[PDB]
Amino acid sequence: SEESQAFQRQLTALIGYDVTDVSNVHDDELEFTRRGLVTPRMAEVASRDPKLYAMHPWVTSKPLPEYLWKKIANNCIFIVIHRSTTSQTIKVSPDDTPGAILQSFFTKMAKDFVLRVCGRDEYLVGETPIKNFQWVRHCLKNGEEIHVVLDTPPDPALDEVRKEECDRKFRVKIRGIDIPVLLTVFVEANIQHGQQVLCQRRTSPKPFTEEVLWNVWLEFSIKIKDLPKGALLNLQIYCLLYYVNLLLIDHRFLLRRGEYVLHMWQISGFNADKLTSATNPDKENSMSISILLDNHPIARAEMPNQLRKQLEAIIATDPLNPLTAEDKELLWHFRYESLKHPKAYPKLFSSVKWGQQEIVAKTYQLLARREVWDQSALDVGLTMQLLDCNFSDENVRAIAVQKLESLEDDDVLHYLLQLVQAVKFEPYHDSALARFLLKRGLRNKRIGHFLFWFLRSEIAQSRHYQQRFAVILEAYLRGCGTAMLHDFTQQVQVIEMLQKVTLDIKSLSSSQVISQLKQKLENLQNSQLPESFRVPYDPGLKAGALAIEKCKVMASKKKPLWLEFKCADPTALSNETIGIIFKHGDDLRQDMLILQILRIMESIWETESLDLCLLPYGCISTGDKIGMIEIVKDATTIAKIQQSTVGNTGAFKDEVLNHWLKEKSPTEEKFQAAVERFVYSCAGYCVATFVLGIGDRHNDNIMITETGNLFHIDFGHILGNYVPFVLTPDFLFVMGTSGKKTSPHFQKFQDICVKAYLALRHHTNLLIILFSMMLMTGMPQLTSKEDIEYIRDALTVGKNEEDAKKYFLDQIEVCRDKGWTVQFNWFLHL
Ligand SMILES: Cc1ccc(-c2ccc3ncc4c(c3n2)n(C2CCN(C(=O)[C@H](C)O)CC2)c(=O)n4C)cn1
């Protein structure tokens, strides 16, 4: 068509990369996957209830926690309804369904419509108890009234989707390399499967010059018939300067034959990029390498006591404890006993010699007998581990994905960020995981909204993986709907203009500066910007006009914008603005990863009726060293609370914070809250920050609210260029204690710590796989391997709870002993 040739022009502005281009490819895998995805998209589209998908309730089926029942008086919750300007409060039992709340409104008063939340694009539709809606649970948690404005349901029609239509050893010739500019140099060629190295050959050292030829045949000691699907020819160049990869078996199961001229990635300064099947786009600068392939089809007893226990002691250890050869042979030989334990599956499948046809054969035999796995309750940590870089076999990976299909929307959103990062571990573009994320993001607008920005973030700052991601996004967009498709267009229009203002103001560096900013913010507020837009980190909110008066640039080398917006929705029960920081220079990708692990930890604590009161504030990476950050209301930096009444000195006073807190409390009662709120929040971050190894931080990078909530910021600043945590004399002061001593609050502190710390240890393996995946996909440079193992030590694995409660309280003590040494040390950092 012609429209459809322009429709693709919009997608390409939404995606941020051109997926029709075919100039940095060397085969039809991408078109093949774009093509392959057409089906699961239309498949999912045709299956979503059009209504429930237009109104996208945000529900959970988990149990309403204790701390929120004990915040309810008596099976009685209050929902303040709004029609016009009339109010009316009503009684509700936590078990009252939203649909039956109208059989209590068109009947419970006399002398069609659906309940929408005031100020937000959030509804309470569908057959759920209201105690189970997230918004309700958020209003309960922070002591707030539930305001709904009854009105007309959106029209599914606006969601409508636009209409569719041999024993021969393997060998490879290294013709030679060539860099358009500069030593001795040789080529390494490895056959890899899941970080496992099947064979390795080399070249003769040639003289490092702008061109180098070899015309050699490197014969491998692997039979053609023993190549497993998903095996990579991995080509590298030492003097290690460059790598590139090529799948030996292809998306159509063909042995790869022909000539290839592959352009190569440079090292700099382990991680996920190094695994990509993508060649460099930058053909002008990139060293390349030329090669040639011509060579096609593709195809229980008992146990000694000591052995069983030796096997038991293997199954039990954490995901990072290395497997010896003796360990592996033992898992393999007793594989059938090993299959009875879902916990065994990562290590058992790491015992497989994947370079051997017949072994792989038996492994698939093993997978066919999968009932104990199939029948076991979903364990996400177990499941994440089969999706990491250690597994290249499709059938193994796909049984992990099968296990994820049972996640309800709530939990998909907890792990969405890292499931999307996990795509980098997929050997091929079309996978069960890439299709799984398609389905869940086509079924649910909140998942799909977030999926858009996660994918879009990667496309804009990763050339290693943008193509694969581009293809997944396109497939998403062709199924989200015109409504959302238009809503996504509003959003990108806005954040591209603001990024522009962001980078511009940044270069201009002040007295003058404050002038320009306000002036550019005057332009955009005409007929270039639309009237409003969903805040990307909180799809619930629509931002209207820029409170120009309130906007500003900030003191900070790289100089972020402090923007504020009016809520674009009239039914908004207040006139508080929406506050966003736009910033360049920080790797906000790392911040996303840490923030989301924080939400997971909050969630692990919920399982055990704890609320450690963290503030994982919204954060969306939009490009390389650029993105936006949600503003927390009524907050200041801890430093600043010191700079207030000691002023830019370092002469740290122990009394200031408990003063500032009383200085900000409306009463003495609300003051105690701010002290209740503080001791929890302080311990929440102390534990969480210590586990991740980002607890040794600087005074300026920690904040509090005029109501007691502590929370860390800037997590890129450490994991991004890099005492146990931070439990300082000022913090302890609010906790009643001084120097060396004790008090009722401080002990409470310690009891909340030890509970929280222990509660995370219950989920050791989960945390470890998440930490481990984070470093590989999001911490460039910071891998080493011996970075990974930190969280092993941190979570004090192998130790008893008793040894555990101990170790943490001691970690706490290094906080009393050091006092100010470090904060002052960080200050003295000029
Ligand atoms: C990487 C990174 C950057 C910013 C933030 C961040 C997050 C929430 C904030 N809320 C209020 C507030 C902030 C905030 N800064 N800020 C600052 C903190 C310091 N800052 C930085 O960029 C630090 C120095 O790197 C600018 C934003 C405020 O002033 N207020 C009131 C988190 N991570």
Curated annotation (Swiss-Prot):
Keywords: Angiogenesis, ATP-binding, Cell membrane, Chemotaxis, Cytoplasm, Disease variant, Endocytosis, Immunity, Inflammatory response, Kinase, Lipid metabolism, Membrane, Nucleotide-binding, Phosphoprotein, Serine/threonine-protein kinase, Transferase. GO terms for biological process: adaptive immune response; angiogenesis; cell migration; cellular response to cAMP; dendritic cell chemotaxis; endocytosis; G protein-coupled receptor signaling pathway; hepatocyte apoptotic process. Residues 712-728 are annotated as: Activation loop. Residues 74-152 form the PI3K-RBD domain. The modification Phosphothreonine is found at residue 764. Changing residue 761 to P: In IMD97; loss of phosphatidylinositol-3,4-bisphosphate 5-kinase activity. It is an enzyme of class 2 (transferase). Activated by both the alpha and the beta-gamma G proteins following stimulation of G protein-coupled receptors (GPCRs). Activation by GPCRs is assisted by the regulatory subunits (PIK3R5 or PIK3R6) leading to the translocation from the cytosol to the plasma membrane and to kinase activation. Inhibited by AS-604850 and AS-605240. InterPro entries: ARM-type_fold, C2_domain_sf, Kinase-like_dom_sf, PI3/4_kinase_cat_dom, PI3/4_kinase_cat_sf, PI3/4_kinase_CS, PI3K-type_C2_dom, PI3K_ABD. Belongs to the PI3/PI4-kinase family. Heterodimer of a catalytic subunit PIK3CG and a PIK3R5 or PIK3R6 regulatory subunit. Interacts with GRK2 through the PIK helical domain. Interaction with GRK2 is required for targeting to agonist-occupied receptor. Interacts with PDE3B; regulates PDE3B activity and thereby cAMP levels in cells. Interacts with TPM2. Interacts with EPHA8; regulates integrin-mediated cell adhesion to substrate. Interacts with HRAS; the interaction is required for membrane recruitment and beta-gamma G protein dimer-dependent activation of the PI3K gamma complex PIK3CG:PIK3R6. Phosphoinositide-3-kinase (PI3K) that phosphorylates PtdIns(4,5)P2 (Phosphatidylinositol 4,5-bisphosphate) to generate phosphatidylinositol 3,4,5-trisphosphate (PIP3). PIP3 plays a key role by recruiting PH domain-containing proteins to the membrane, including AKT1 and PDPK1, activating signaling cascades involved in cell growth, survival, proliferation, motility and morphology. Links G-protein coupled receptor activation to PIP3 production. Involved in immune, inflammatory and allergic responses. Modulates leukocyte chemotaxis to inflammatory sites and in response to chemoattractant agents. It is linked to Immunodeficiency 97 with autoinflammation: An autosomal recessive disorder with variable features. Affected individuals have childhood-onset antibody defects, cytopenias, and T lymphocytic pneumonitis and colitis. Some patients may have features of hemophagocytic lymphohistiocytosis. This is Phosphatidylinositol 4,5-bisphosphate 3-kinase catalytic subunit gamma isoform. The lineage of its organism: Eukaryota, Metazoa, Chordata, Craniata, Vertebrata. The gene is PIK3CG.
